[PDB]
Design a protein around this motif. Sequence first.
Motif, short mmCIF file in Angstrom:
data_model
loop_
_atom_site.label_atom_id
_atom_site.label_comp_id
_atom_site.label_asym_id
_atom_site.label_seq_id
_atom_site.Cartn_x
_atom_site.Cartn_y
_atom_site.Cartn_z
N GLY A 70 -2.07 -0.94 1.45
CA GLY A 70 -3.04 -0.54 2.50
C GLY A 70 -3.50 -1.73 3.30
O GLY A 70 -3.67 -1.65 4.49
N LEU A 71 -3.82 -2.82 2.63
CA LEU A 71 -4.32 -3.99 3.30
C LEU A 71 -3.27 -4.56 4.24
O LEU A 71 -3.58 -4.99 5.35
N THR A 72 -2.03 -4.54 3.82
CA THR A 72 -0.92 -5.05 4.67
C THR A 72 -0.64 -4.11 5.88
O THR A 72 -0.41 -4.61 6.99
N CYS A 73 -0.76 -2.80 5.71
CA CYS A 73 -0.74 -1.84 6.81
C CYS A 73 -1.78 -2.21 7.83
O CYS A 73 -1.48 -2.32 9.01
N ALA A 74 -3.00 -2.44 7.37
CA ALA A 74 -4.08 -2.80 8.29
C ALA A 74 -3.76 -4.08 9.02
O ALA A 74 -4.02 -4.20 10.22
N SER A 75 -3.25 -5.06 8.29
CA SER A 75 -2.84 -6.33 8.89
C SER A 75 -1.79 -6.16 9.99
O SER A 75 -1.95 -6.70 11.10
N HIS A 76 -0.74 -5.42 9.70
CA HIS A 76 0.33 -5.15 10.69
C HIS A 76 -0.22 -4.43 11.90
O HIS A 76 0.16 -4.79 13.01
N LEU A 77 -1.05 -3.44 11.68
CA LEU A 77 -1.60 -2.62 12.76
C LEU A 77 -2.47 -3.48 13.66
O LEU A 77 -2.31 -3.42 14.91
N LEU A 78 -3.34 -4.27 13.06
CA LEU A 78 -4.27 -5.06 13.84
C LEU A 78 -3.53 -6.19 14.54
O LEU A 78 -4.04 -6.78 15.52
N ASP A 79 -2.38 -6.55 14.06
CA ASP A 79 -1.58 -7.58 14.75
C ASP A 79 -0.93 -6.99 16.01
O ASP A 79 -0.40 -7.76 16.80
N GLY A 106 -7.72 -12.97 0.84
CA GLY A 106 -7.20 -13.59 2.07
C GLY A 106 -6.84 -12.53 3.07
O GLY A 106 -7.24 -12.60 4.26
N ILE A 107 -6.11 -11.51 2.64
CA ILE A 107 -5.74 -10.44 3.58
C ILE A 107 -6.98 -9.64 4.03
O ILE A 107 -7.13 -9.30 5.21
N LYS A 108 -7.91 -9.39 3.12
CA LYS A 108 -9.07 -8.65 3.39
C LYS A 108 -9.90 -9.42 4.46
O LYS A 108 -10.41 -8.80 5.41
N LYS A 152 -8.77 -11.56 6.69
CA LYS A 152 -8.06 -11.50 7.95
C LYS A 152 -8.30 -10.18 8.65
O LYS A 152 -8.58 -10.14 9.87
N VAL A 153 -8.24 -9.06 7.92
CA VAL A 153 -8.40 -7.78 8.56
C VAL A 153 -9.86 -7.46 8.91
O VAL A 153 -10.12 -6.85 9.96
N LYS A 154 -10.80 -7.96 8.11
CA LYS A 154 -12.22 -7.88 8.45
C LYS A 154 -12.50 -8.65 9.75
O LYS A 154 -13.20 -8.13 10.63
N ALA A 155 -11.95 -9.85 9.85
CA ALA A 155 -12.19 -10.70 11.02
C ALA A 155 -11.67 -10.03 12.26
O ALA A 155 -12.28 -10.18 13.33
N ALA A 156 -10.56 -9.27 12.12
CA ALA A 156 -9.98 -8.54 13.25
C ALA A 156 -10.67 -7.18 13.54
O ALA A 156 -10.20 -6.43 14.42
N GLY A 157 -11.74 -6.86 12.79
CA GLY A 157 -12.60 -5.70 13.09
C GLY A 157 -12.47 -4.50 12.21
O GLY A 157 -13.14 -3.50 12.43
N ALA A 158 -11.61 -4.56 11.19
CA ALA A 158 -11.51 -3.44 10.24
C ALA A 158 -12.84 -3.30 9.53
O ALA A 158 -13.48 -4.32 9.19
N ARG A 159 -13.21 -2.07 9.26
CA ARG A 159 -14.37 -1.77 8.48
C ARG A 159 -14.02 -1.19 7.11
O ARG A 159 -13.30 -0.28 7.03
N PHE A 160 -14.62 -1.76 6.08
CA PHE A 160 -14.32 -1.44 4.71
C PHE A 160 -15.42 -0.57 4.16
O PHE A 160 -16.60 -0.84 4.37
N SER A 161 -15.00 0.51 3.53
CA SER A 161 -15.87 1.38 2.78
C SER A 161 -15.33 1.53 1.37
O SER A 161 -14.58 2.44 1.06
N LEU A 162 -15.78 0.62 0.50
CA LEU A 162 -15.29 0.53 -0.87
C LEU A 162 -16.24 1.36 -1.76
O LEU A 162 -17.45 1.50 -1.41
N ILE A 164 -8.13 5.10 13.41
CA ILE A 164 -7.13 4.93 12.31
C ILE A 164 -7.90 4.86 11.00
O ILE A 164 -8.86 4.14 10.89
N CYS A 165 -7.43 5.56 9.98
CA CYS A 165 -8.03 5.42 8.70
C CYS A 165 -6.94 5.12 7.67
O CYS A 165 -5.91 5.75 7.69
N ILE A 166 -7.18 4.16 6.81
CA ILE A 166 -6.25 3.88 5.73
C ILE A 166 -7.04 4.14 4.46
O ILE A 166 -8.14 3.56 4.25
N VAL A 167 -6.48 5.01 3.58
CA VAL A 167 -7.05 5.24 2.29
C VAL A 167 -6.22 4.50 1.27
O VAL A 167 -5.03 4.75 1.17
#
Lengths: 414, 411
Positions: free
Chosen positions: A13-22, A187-189, A191-201, A4-7
């Motif tokens: 975007g961050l909330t998409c990632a949150s919902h998906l990882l939930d 806070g959201i970032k 949460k989603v990092k802790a759940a394994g999302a990888r950030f490329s800023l 999955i990639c979110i641009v």
Amino acid sequence: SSDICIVGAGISGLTCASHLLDSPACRGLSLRIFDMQQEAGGRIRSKMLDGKASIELGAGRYSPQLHPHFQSAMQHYSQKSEVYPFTQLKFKSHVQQKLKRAMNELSPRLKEHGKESFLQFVSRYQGHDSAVGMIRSMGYDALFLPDISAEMAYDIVGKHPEIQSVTDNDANQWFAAETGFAGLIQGIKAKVKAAGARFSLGYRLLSVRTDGDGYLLQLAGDDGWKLEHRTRHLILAIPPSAMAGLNVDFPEAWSGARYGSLPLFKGFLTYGEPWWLDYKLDDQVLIVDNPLRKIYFKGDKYLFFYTDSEMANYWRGCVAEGEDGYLEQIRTHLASALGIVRERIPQPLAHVHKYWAHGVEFCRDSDIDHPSALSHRDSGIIACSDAYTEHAGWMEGGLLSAREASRLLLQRIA
Amino acid sequence: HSSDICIVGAGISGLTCASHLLDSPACRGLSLRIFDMQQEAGGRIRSKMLDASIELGAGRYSPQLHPHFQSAMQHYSQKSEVYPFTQLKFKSHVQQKLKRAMNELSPRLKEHGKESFLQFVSRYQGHDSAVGMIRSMGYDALFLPDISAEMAYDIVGKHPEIQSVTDNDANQWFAAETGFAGLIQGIKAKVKAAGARFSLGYRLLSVRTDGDGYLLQLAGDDGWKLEHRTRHLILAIPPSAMAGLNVDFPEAWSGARYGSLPLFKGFLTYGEPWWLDYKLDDQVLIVDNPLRKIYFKGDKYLFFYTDSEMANYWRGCVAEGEDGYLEQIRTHLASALGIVRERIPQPLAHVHKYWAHGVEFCRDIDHPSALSHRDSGIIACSDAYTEHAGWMEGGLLSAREASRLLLQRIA
Ligand SMILES: Cc1cc2nc3c(=O)[nH]c(=O)nc-3n(C[C@H](O)[C@H](O)[C@H](O)COP(=O)(O)OP(=O)(O)OC[C@H]3O[C@@H](n4cnc5c(N)ncnc54)[C@H](O)[C@@H]3O)c2cc1C
Ligand SMILES: Cc1cc2nc3c(=O)[nH]c(=O)nc-3n(C[C@H](O)[C@H](O)[C@H](O)COP(=O)(O)OP(=O)(O)OC[C@H]3O[C@@H](n4cnc5c(N)ncnc54)[C@H](O)[C@@H]3O)c2cc1C
Ligand SMILES: N[C@@H](Cc1c[nH]c2ccccc12)C(=O)O
Ligand SMILES: N[C@@H](Cc1c[nH]c2ccccc12)C(=O)O
């Protein structure tokens, strides 16, 4: 590579990632998030102004009555709110004193003429000069745009805190983040990092091509580094304007709908003295005819002004012309606004500003239902933005769009 | 939005052009505008406080090689500290042989010095030996086909870690005590006081002549479009940047051919100067592994510095993510020292910078130190045009000649 990639790492975007990882359906699907900026948040941009006050260069206020998802998010992430004071005009002009009646008088004519530009609508009944004076008194220059209808104007008026009293919406309460909405983004970032999302800023997406079952993304680092990224499922959590760079045929391959845009500008100024206390302006807002337009005095800490549309472009041109001239203009307009001599407005200490070329994006008026998130008709790429919602131009809309975009991706995965 | 004189680029070159011009009686009261696409001046000079001030870009100078630069430091009251990385204390067996081997090759620069450095050494030592020998100098640019043998000796003789290989170990080196950003701030302050106006955060996109003058199209970093009219224009930007504009560079300017290569620095701090146990304070190691040149600064921090294909290596590593990046570093530090990885602590903080066009240079000619566009009179200013390409000195030299050229237009 990712599943999955979110641009886009704004609130959408961050909330998409949150919902998906939930979701149990995303277990073992890797998730990569890109953003062209070095920090998350998009049009949420908090800053500490010269160590004195936390200010909002972007999104600044919310209402529990209008924005229940956002209220819930603030609570979930343990974020402190404070009362947002700028919900009435303590010092009305004679025109502003008649606004509520003037608007009420015209409101039954929305049935017959509500689709036309607000300027034309008001002018239909008052004539040009009167219309201009009345409209300008509300401080939002979008209200003069040909593509903002009378219907849309009454909606804008009713949802903005400074002028919500004009359409009898005084009951809606307003709050700001004590230490900035960037805290919610963080806070959201987290949460989603802790759940394994990888950030490329710091990577700008340049183009997308399908390639077999998935997609190949071309990106560029802000330092020039080129990167290619392969994914199976793609959310573009970016505004409509951003959807153009790319080669995804937006909007014709998506909704075929039309989208509006307007620019925004905020300038914040600190002073040696809280000089406005003497005029009883602390925690008040003045709406003026001059280019400052809406002037806010926050406690005894700072003041700021906020403009849109033509007047945001006006200010950004002034900034381009030079800092000295920009500050001189502000000083001149502050003095005119208060009815005092220019030298009685002090020179400022530290100041900061932000121009947003596309500060607000939205769906233009249609009879065709517009879903909260969109899908590319051939490739199944998903598009996610506050702009696609009835809360366009509000964080709540991004939260709404993200629920739907997550829903759509989950249906694609299933 | 207009000026008499417009300088695009606020690195040391552009800022020095403004300084020269505002010093001149011919420019008294003239309107001078300086643009740069970044929000701060300095270009490839970028100092930072590492949670010690460090140099993410330019890091050292020599009074012997760089008299104009030394004079600027002295003029702007900038203090110096000794730059200790001027000899290799822990030479490998191949490093021990470098001075003799480079001596032996030197007469042959007359015969084959325009061939690439790799081809030149291979011609006499064979590929394998050549590879081993060139690698031991720590600069991967020396493998590039665009770098001639003559260019390679110039490089080796001008870099402090290897200057001893060509008998240049009399040259002395210093860093800025408070960072080279202080010099940039000095220069910026002086030109602002003299009336220069700055527009930082604007990228020049194109230029056209506009009868007598020039019309520039710029974009703000927030998307704001700006047109600027000027009567005299200096492009104080490197060749890569020139080639991005619509000014037919390099064909209308010199027809010389220019090269470029990337650079990468990474800086790490720790809870103890653990390297003091190995007597590595103020030493540099040059190694075959991807770190390439590893520096231990007194008891304060360590850093590594790579170029060309190894700068790309690290930047890819960063793109893959911070954990792998930092574990790669720890692994390579252990290998360089010949110790186990467990003996290397995790850092407290680190910072890095990749520069996609870190060094730009003329490949090869009577190349002047600054160029003019043949029809339009636009002036080009860069270290790359000079015999000190890839050094601040070269920017100062180009600026002298750019200012001279512009003052000639003005008269
Ligand atoms: C001045 C101003 C005041 C505001 N006031 C309020 C307010 O008081 N209350 C309120 O509720 N809302 C307010 N808003 C609106 C609120 O900011 C938006 O509704 C919300 O933040 C939009 O979130 P989003 O994630 O959909 O889009 P964004 O926040 O725009 O995020 C999109 C992200 O996509 C990235 N991006 C775009 N293109 C690319 C690409 N090609 N590659 C990589 N990344 C890309 C961007 O860098 C950005 O981070 C304000 C906005 C502004 C500008
Ligand atoms: C990692 C590294 C280490 C170095 N070590 C040393 C050293 O130890 N000693 C030494 O003397 N030198 C060193 N240098 C070299 C030195 O940094 C350069 O020689 C010098 O800084 C070049 O100055 P300049 O002003 O010519 O170019 P730059 O510093 O590159 O300045 C050019 C400016 O032009 C701006 N620009 C470019 N294109 C546009 C556009 N289209 N519109 C607007 N603005 C534009 C850029 O933003 C930049 O600020 C090092 C460089 C690097 C990268
Ligand atoms: N809601 C945001 C932005 C916004 C929505 N619609 C607008 C119309 C005009 C100006 C701004 C807006 C605000 O409070 O500012
Ligand atoms: N002189 C700079 C950069 C430089 C010039 N030529 C080079 C060749 C290779 C690598 C770096 C360079 C330095 O000290 O680092």
